[PDB]
């Protein structure tokens with residue numbers, strides 16, 4: 001029923017063709033319940049020039065949505081298209097491109113409408129403008145498409161960093177708990193709150209790189225879990241350095257001990273300073 | 288109610304054997320349901336000492352609903368029947384008097 | 397102990413019909429059990445001149461428990477039987493004597 | 503019979519105590535032994551037919 | 553039923569002499585001929601229409 | 604009625620003869636001829652509801 | 658022998674469905690491991706009671722999908738240098754509590770081969786077990802019945818659902834023409850069935866709505882994610898088999914998810 005949610009956060013509709021503002025989406029992925037819209041504004045057909053006027057100054061980097069800020073053409077179809085690229089690790093990236101016609105955008109331009117017409121059988125966008133110029137112009141090959149993949153992932157990731165560090169460039173090790181708790185959704189288990197309230201010492205912080213890497217690590221969650229099959233069935237709880245080289249070869253993204261020690265310090269309720277499979281992975285499969 | 292029980296018992300075994308599954312997988316329940324009864328009857332006879340014939344089994348059940356119906360309604364029953372005894376007992380005696388009075392024949396006893 | 401046997405004959409046939417055998421291989425046994433039972437319910441009548449009727453057939457068994465057991469505990473049922481009627485006879489004779497319409501005692 | 507000859511209402515007839523649950527204490531633990539002496543029989547009989 | 557109306561106890565109901573044998577020795581050998589009649593009947597039955 | 608009753612129970616057995624043996628399969632008639640049995644043991648109870656004597 | 662072993666035939670299946678490896682390898686292990694169903698082994702100069710650690714390794718040589726075991730290969734390479742001998746290898750083998758070592762590090766057991774040979778070794782083993790199973794279904798004219806090719810799926814999936822079980826039986830009604838299923842048109846499908854993990858991922862947009870892409874581009878996107886082609890008819894029976902809802906398509910809850918969770 002994602003469509004019904006898409007109606008909630010969206011406030012721009014055209015004969016039922018609800019267009020999403022760039023902010024609504026970013027709010028649909030950051031916040032969970034927001035209702036202040038009270039608007040059917042876009043009916044005046046300013047849309048056809050509204051977006052194209054403002055997209056001409058878009059930041060191709062990690063600000064492609066932090067540059068427009070609630071003005072842009074985002075269709076419900078494209079909305080879901082971001083949801084699927086939300087969860088793609090590096091592995092699926094080439095495949096997600098290869099899932100499309102893979103013969104260059106000459107065969108992938110129509111795939112956009114094909115993306116649209118797919119939802120129809122089931123029953124001028126900002127991206128298409130950035131992907132195909134004005135009327136199907138730009139030849140957005142894989143790497144160019146891949147560029148748009150990672151930064152937009154980083155973007156939603158990055159903006160999340162501020163929402164917990166309250167804008168400051170540093171996130172208290174205590175703040176980093178809620179994000180994990182908001183991730184694992186096992187927050188009602190006070191034992192972890194009991195764990196963090198004493199085991200964690202309110203001290204230094206975590207920068208964006210250490211957090212953005214960790215968030216990216218979870219994008220590759222599965223490949224890590226498989227590399228942990230031999231140990232999970234062995235039930236031997238993992239040590240820090242073991243866990244580092246593990247996630248190293250698992251995701252390809254190194255982490256900082258300043259994170260995982262806390263991750264250990266919060267997830268090692270057994271008190272052995274070693275993460276068994278049911279300790280970390282067990283709660284991670286709550287959602 | 289027993290007729291209803293006996294009615295659906297003929298439907299939920301009719302549709303379930305012509306439109307639905309089959310005969311050859313209902314028969315091994317068809318049989319097990321009759322033999323299912325035959326225990327209940329026997330179980331009834333062990334539960335209470337009657338061979339479970341309807342015109343009797345009704346009256347026993349009726350008799351429960353009466354006592355449970357009367358004892359709930361607080362209406363006395365012991366003193367009622369004792370009254371009803373005293374009537375017939377006294378009545379039947381008056382019947383014995385028909386011989387020596389209306390007929391002058393010796394009284395039977 | 398009747399209902400016990402009358403339950404295993406549902407157990408024995410529960411498995412033998414679905415679990416471990418077919419039904420078309422186990423139906424002709426239940427029949428030759430029905431028409432084997434309904435022979436006993438007749439042979440029982442030829443042995444003792446009455447029908448297999450639960451209340452009676454129970455009692456006619458019950459007595460054979462009694463006369464056997466009473467024979468073991470040795471007490472002269474014949475006397476008790478004899479002595480019992482006289483009570484229900486002398487008493488009846490008295491109720492006939494205090495007849496409230498037949499003055500014998502004022 | 504609802505009422506005796508006098509018209510008096512017959513006594514509340516006796517229902518055996520816990521009967522409906524007294525009977526399950528014999529039929530239920532015997533339905534099972536009614537089954538298990540089939541398993542130990544079919545396997546005891548398979549070696550010469552089916 | 554079980555006790556006389558006076559309160560006395562019914563007499564010892566009768567069991568015929570070894571009747572449980574008297575019934576086996578007449579059900580078994582006639583259970584046996586009921587078989588034998590069929591097989592011989594089965595032969596004549598096969599020499600004609602049905603089987 | 605006694606004769607008329609029997610004549611029924613002698614044609615109902617005459618119907619299920621032709622049908623079963625040399626017009627259909629017994630595996631076709633049987634699922635009826637159990638119902639007829641149960642049909643009787645339903646009426647033979649219905650009679651007790653109307654009449655109130657077995 | 659009707660009901661003799663139709664308990665153990667299901668029990669051993671239930672063991673092979675989900676159980677502890679202890680008795681699983683007690684069935685010696687030298688080559689009895691082929692009991693894991695219901696030409697490498699000629700090169701198995703093994704020792705009968707080999708291990709259960711290697712067993713854990715062994716099934717993963719068939720359990721881990723294509724792109725993922727590269728990480729297991731990388732995880733195996735904690736020494737780096739593109740090569741790791743028994744030191745790390747046999748250690749993580751011991752943490753749970755030989756021919757492969759003689760097949761990898763030579764009969765000398767010391768000469769460390771390039772552990773890149775972990776892939777090809779994984780390739781043939783997935784083939785051979787699939788091969789021997791293909792003969793277990795007695796390929797007539799090098800081909801097997803569509804109800805057999807569908808049967809092994811059920812044997813692969815290992816699910817207990819009477820409906821699709823009967824659908825496996827009913828397929829001769831849905832397919833009475835008869836074509837036979839060759840060993841290649843089934844091996845390509847399993848390689849796809851191996852890398853299911855990425856398919857649903859690649860299929861997530863469809864998953865956001867459903868219908869599992871009309872059975873044709875399904876086969877097309879298969880080759881994309883599976884790196885191997887399938888025919889048309891090979892998958893038509895699969896969609897005909899797993900069409901539990903009768904819609905003519907699949908939900909994730911119809912076919913895909915069951916495959917996904919199968920990797921337990």
Ligand SMILES: [Ca+2]
Pocket residue numbers: 314423633
């Ligand atoms: Ca039959």
